[PDB]
Design a protein around this nucleic acid. Structure first.
Lengths: 98, 80, 95, 105, 106, 95, 98, 84
DNA sequence: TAGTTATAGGTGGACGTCTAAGATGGTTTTCACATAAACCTTTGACGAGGTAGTTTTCCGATGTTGAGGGGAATCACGGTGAACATGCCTTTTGATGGAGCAGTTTCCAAATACACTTTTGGTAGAATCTGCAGGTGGATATTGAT
DNA sequence: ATCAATATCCACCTGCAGATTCTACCAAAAGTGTATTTGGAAACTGCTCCATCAAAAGGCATGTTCACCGTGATTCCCCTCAACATCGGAAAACTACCTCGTCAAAGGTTTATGTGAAAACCATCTTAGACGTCCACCTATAACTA
């Protein structure tokens, strides 16, 4: 039997994904989340196929970016693990929670 | 019903990894979803405000982009 | 003479309106003045952009609305938007 | 003759705004109701602050509203603070707020 | 007749820009040299990216410049990255950069 | 007919002027186009504003300059402001 | 002999300065720094009194505002002392050093 | 006339620095800070003044006005109130 | 260190959309001569006001001496996240019937563009305010040792 | 567990400056009113592209179980906080003094506002056709114990 060490095949992913450009959310759950929030905001609305991805591209690139900043927050606390406490600090300094 | 929970915990960590992320808490995945919702809400809100103004019933890519611009998230690649 | 028209006259009017027994430092009035201006530019352009976006060649009250509905935070938008349609509709009737 | 402002029951200069939207190259063509609508939005917001400013000036035991009062207003208020996010007020000071981690024992 | 672009030795549409500055309500009166000047600035910047894009597309062993190449260009470059600060590129990816605190042991 | 004018024709021209044996995606073209568009808007307004600041009733190449010097970072501004004054002087002379 | 405890007459100021609105740099040493950075940038220039103060107001405000953000970066890392490490982070997420 | 300018950046007194810091809600301040700060300030000022002058220059004027300073701060996304 | 799990890759042959050469129709611009209308380069000149220059005053700055206590430095070892699996719901990856909404041609007004014709501003110009900006006690908290 | 004892509000009251508050007057704007100007919102109408429902990979979803990283302290080493000593230098008056940025003129461009006639450049794709997906097949670089 073989076993990978904890937090070390983790890296294989990071590099792999940092190399790739593609969307890390399946369009459909996202599609569902978008259409929901729009109707939960204005009754019966349609969306250009482009418009949905456009949003996803935006959405992800943001999280992507947020996480980067959240990363450093952890490391600053002499920590290794990201937690609500970080995102809080991240968003508060950014100015969206400030 | 919980399409916000449709943003899969792996899809979350995949996005996290891309940020250069080594260790991820269980509490994160919820917090994240929250933030995303907030983000989306804010965008879509403004996005629709345009669709609505155009006297249109279909949300265009332009609407989505003009909203992102307003937000200070200037998007490239959709006629933006 | 130089002549640099402001708003102090009106800001004073709308002060005495809410608070008839309260003054105001010229410094504060300046801040206040930079505000009404800042706010103007913000809305005006956001609406200027609108006509363009919509290939519309005329600025309308309808444009101001959506600009206001975009730029202004929650309840404040609602309250402003209201008073807008309110003074407008008064101007339409009382011609 | 009747002032266009009084034709909307406003203290703010409806005519001025109409000119100010021309002298800004905002569009090829300015509306007739838009300078009215906007002049009111501005009126409202002005009065809205002044409202919160007056009370601020009163809590601090004074007649004339000074800068600090405008900041104590805006920053203590929820929505204005959001609207005036990227904005700094001259002689504004700051909301006294010490972290509940640095406080004694 | 001679194209106004060739009258400045440019590939970018000098006439188009002249019209585009009118159809934008930028000012009461547009200049004659301004649509020229600007058309060139744009030309330069376009070419400037494309330059860094080409090489990026070449380092990754391809002919056609795709989105990723544009991002790999912009974000790896110092100044463009600053200019396109608040900007996100569709299908851009990210610069691979792991923190030198999470890396193994030896 | 619809007619949706872009820049792609020129974008490709200057592309082959820097790398003759190198193409482009359509998706990458869209990004490139959005750039020249955003960058257009950026400097434009910046300079549109500049006239008004200095009470000038006409945009000039001069307003573009200072606008570029403002909008563009360090060395890239220098290199830009160059080709600008360059292509300009070529138009003035070869008129 | 009367002595205040270390880190307790500290707070006096906090409460004292947070309440006031005056500028915490002397006008003149500031004056010079502005004239310097501007002259050793564009020679033989002049500054309207206001244009100088307008700068200072802004400069001060900025830093106080930065310190806020900085403080939270100390408090995040269990710490209670501001050090370069915090400002680095503070600016980093803010976007100017990223 | 004229005299020259040398470490006016050091003219931003260490106390003046901590006074500003206290107003941020600051309890403990390192010795290394005071330099870092000065750095940041310089950077700030540089960036502002740069753009600020770019306006003065454009106006064909030799005197830096409050407006120039403010139009610069606006550009920076530091919208200033109280100077016109 | 030498493995032996796990694919770091890694390097080359056909289908396959989907670059981009082409052409054809425009056709929408783009240009290129018209004509004062008017937006801007002087160009004096007069003062604001910004620089410098001088002085007297006290108000923060600096430069020590301690040393309480906050920063990190490591342990107990709890116990929280990452593997390494199959368990499969559901999200792709493909058709196909009309709500919307662009492209057309229109009087209907809903703003431009002027001529004067009264005001509402707006500095300014003082004209007297009279709110609050420090000055010396003073009663009053709350630290920080008796 | 009660007493020193700064420095806080804060109590008035000096008095000093920065509000308004008349009283205009240029008088810039704003407003009244009329033809002209055109941008719109008016109603049609042929379809692009949006939502319908359904075949089979793709990857989501707990489960099990173990290996390090904080809802544990504790130590202690030296960071920087707190009086206080002591002038240097910021501030806060005025005095030149002359540098430059406005008000007014004043032609001299520099630009716009018509439209015939050729000239890109974009629907419109039309059609080659070409770079790349998409993975075989074994290199082959690291890895966690043999």
């Amino acid at each position: 039997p073989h076993r990978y060490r904890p937090g070390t095949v983790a890296l294989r992913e990071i590099r792999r994904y940092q190399k790739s450009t593609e969307l890390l959310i399946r369009k459909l759950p996202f599609q569902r989340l978008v259409r929901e929030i729009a109707q939960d905001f204005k009754t019966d609305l349609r969306f250009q196929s482009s418009a949905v991805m456009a949003l996803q591209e935006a959405s992800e690139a943001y999280l992507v970016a947020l996480f980067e900043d959240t990363n450093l927050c952890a490391i600053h606390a002499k920590r290794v693990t990201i937690m609500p406490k970080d995102i809080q600090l991240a968003r508060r300094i950014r100015g969206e929670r400030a | 019903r919980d399409n916000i929970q449709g943003i899969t915990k792996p899809a979350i960590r995949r996005l996290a990894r891309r940020g250069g992320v080594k260790r991820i808490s269980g509490l994160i995945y919820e917090e994240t979803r929250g933030v995303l919702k907030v983000f989306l809400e804010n965008v879509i809100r403004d996005a629709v405000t345009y669709t609505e103004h155009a006297k249109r019933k279909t949300v265009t890519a332009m609407d989505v982009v003009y909203a992102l611009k307003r937000q200070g998230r200037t998007l490239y690649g959709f006629g933006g | 003479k130089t002549r640099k028209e402001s708003y102090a006259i009106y800001v004073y009017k709308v002060l005495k309106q809410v608070h008839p027994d309260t003054g105001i430092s010229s410094k504060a009035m300046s801040i206040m003045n930079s505000f009404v201006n800042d706010v103007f530019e913000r809305i005006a352009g956001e609406a200027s952009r609108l006509a363009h976006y919509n290939k519309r060649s005329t600025i309308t009250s309808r444009e101001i609305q959506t600009a206001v509905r975009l730029l202004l935070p929650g309840e404040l938008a609602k309250h402003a938007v209201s008073e807008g349609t309110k003074a407008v509709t008064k101007y339409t009737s009382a011609k | 003759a009747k002032t266009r402002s009084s034709r909307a029951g406003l203290q703010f200069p409806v005519g001025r705004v109409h000119r100010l939207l021309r002298k800004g190259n905002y569009a090829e063509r300015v509306g007739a109701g838009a300078p009215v609508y906007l002049a009111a939005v501005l009126e409202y917001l002005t009065a809205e602050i002044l409202e919160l400013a007056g009370n601020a000036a009163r809590d601090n035991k004074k007649t004339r509203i000074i800068p600090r009062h405008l900041q104590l207003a805006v920053r203590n208020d929820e929505e204005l603070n959001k609207l005036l996010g990227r904005v700094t007020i001259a002689q504004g000071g700051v909301l006294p707020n010490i972290q509940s981690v640095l406080l004694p024992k």
